[PDB]
Amino acid sequence: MATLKVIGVGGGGNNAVNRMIDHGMNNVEFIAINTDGQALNLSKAESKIQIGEKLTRGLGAGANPEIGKKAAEESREQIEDAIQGADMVFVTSGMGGGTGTGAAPVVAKIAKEMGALTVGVVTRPFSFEGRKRQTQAAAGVEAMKAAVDTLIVIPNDRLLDIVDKSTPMMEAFKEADNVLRQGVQSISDLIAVSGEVNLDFADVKTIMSNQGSALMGIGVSSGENRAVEAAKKAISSPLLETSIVGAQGVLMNITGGESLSLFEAQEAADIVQDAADEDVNMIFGTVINPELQDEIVVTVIATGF
Ligand SMILES: NC(=O)c1c(F)ccc(OCc2nc(-c3ccc(C(F)(F)F)cc3)c(Br)o2)c1F
Ligand SMILES: Nc1nc2c(ncn2[C@@H]2O[C@H](COP(=O)(O)OP(=O)(O)O)[C@@H](O)[C@H]2O)c(=O)[nH]1
Ligand SMILES: [Ca+2]
Q1: Furthest-apart CA pair in the chain: how many Å?
Q2: Are 233 and 220 in contact (CB under 8 A)?
Q3: Domain at 59, CATH number
Q4: Which residue puts its alpha carbon closest to atom 28 of ligand 1?
Q5: CA 105, CA 54: separation in Å to the nearest integer?
Q6: Which residues does the record give as GTP binding sites?
Q7: Rounded CA gap, 72 and 110, in Å?
Q8: Ligand 2 center to residue 94 CA distance, Å?
Q9: CB 11 within 8 A of CB 42
């Protein structure tokens, strides 16, 4: 049974983790990593690592990614110890600050050294934060890409595409944080449940090990044309930087009730295939959940660009 850990690094990453702790994911271990002792003290994470006590005296890294990097390197043994035994690690962080930008790639590097399939989920700053913030964040993203197995990048500007003029900022932030939450829940489902056409953690590693940026999504529909609608929703991910176009690897699962038809499954798979590379390494799964009535749920991860 694969062990999952979710690690928040710096403010934005810990914000994401705090929402997940609030909802509950009993089988998943949450780890909070920060330079900022005040923020870390308020976290309800079961496992906390204050990095850079010597460097920052319990303050943040003040927008200097070199300080975040050095803080993580200084606490390497603590980070190793907290990760040890994980089969899969998610590292969540907002790029552009001091702590996440610098520390998150070190954490991801350690995770992979400890043997974990390592997935980064990171944001790029809003354009309103300025070119400097954006340039620091880009360096972070590239460092993350080099350290992880697979990277999911959410430009914060994409949040401006999903709000109306009154949508509360915290509600917009919840939508961005749901990318991580739904990714973790979906992998938990994959590991826990034996499928009629079973996918397991070795299939996840095949598609996700030593890749780069990825598209992930989930689509739910019912009624007429449900399979096509669910597939299209799964592959259209308005918050992610990466599109499915040209994908060389896909992991795809369809979950339906007892009415799930072979014809529908083909329709959904063809939607996903059509979008990917013609030599796509596609691994397809199915689970029948008799508790469902007319809903279909299509889950996709696409890698290799
Ligand atoms: N067919 C199965 O054995 C199966 C099951 F029984 C339940 C769920 C399930 O798939 C859920 C699923 N989860 C993923 C997935 C893929 C990637 C990630 C990521 F990127 F790590 F976030 C998270 C989740 C995918 Br593609 O599909 C199955 F494949
Ligand atoms: N979407 C989202 N972005 C955030 C959040 N908090 C911070 N950010 C973004 O993450 C960047 C770095 O902030 P933060 O993680 O607090 O800095 P650090 O603690 O110094 O790593 C900011 O420049 C924002 O673009 C959040 O809760 N949600
Ligand atoms: Ca399974």
Answers
A1: 62
A2: yes
A3: 3.40.50.1440
A4: 190
A5: 20
A6: 11-15, 98-100, 129, 133, 177
A7: 10
A8: 4
A9: no
Query: Which residue range forms the structural domain that includes residue 101?
Result: 4-187
- CB-CB contact of 30 with 188 (8 Å): no
Residues whose CB falls within 8 Å of the CB of residue 142, separated by 6 or more in sequence, listed in order:
none
The b/e string for 214-238 (b: 16+ C-beta within 10 A; e otherwise) is bbbbbbebeeeebbbbbbbbbbebe
Q: How far is the CA of 135 from the centre of ligand 2 (A)?
A: 14
Query: This structure's resolution (angstroms)?
Result: 1.7
- Residue 272, CA distances (Å) to 72, 190, 227, 275, 303 in order: 39, 19, 11, 5, 13
Using CA atoms, how far apart are residues 6 and 173, in angstroms rounded to an integer? 18
CA–centroid distance, residue 299 to ligand 1 (Å): 6
Collapse the DSSP code of 33 into the 3-class scheme (helix H, G, I; strand E, B; otherwise coil) and give the result.
strand
> What's the rounded Cα separation, in Å, for the pair 65 and 69?
6
State the burial class of residue 187 (Cβ atoms within 10 Å of its Cβ: 0-12, 13-18, 19+).
Answer: buried
**What does the alpha-carbon distance between residue 274 and residue 263 come to, in Å, rounded to a whole number?**
16
Structure determined by: X-ray
Q: Which of 156, 162, 167, 241 maximizes ligand 2 atoms within 8 Å of its Cβ, making it the mutation to test the pocket? A: 156
Given the structure tokens 């994908």, which residue do they identify?
247
* Nearest one of 189, 228, 235 to 214, comparing CA atoms: 235
Residue of 152, 181, 190 best suited for mutating to test ligand 1, as the one with most atoms within 8 Å of CB: 190
By C-alpha distance, which of 85, 70, 165, 173 is closest to 62?
A: 70
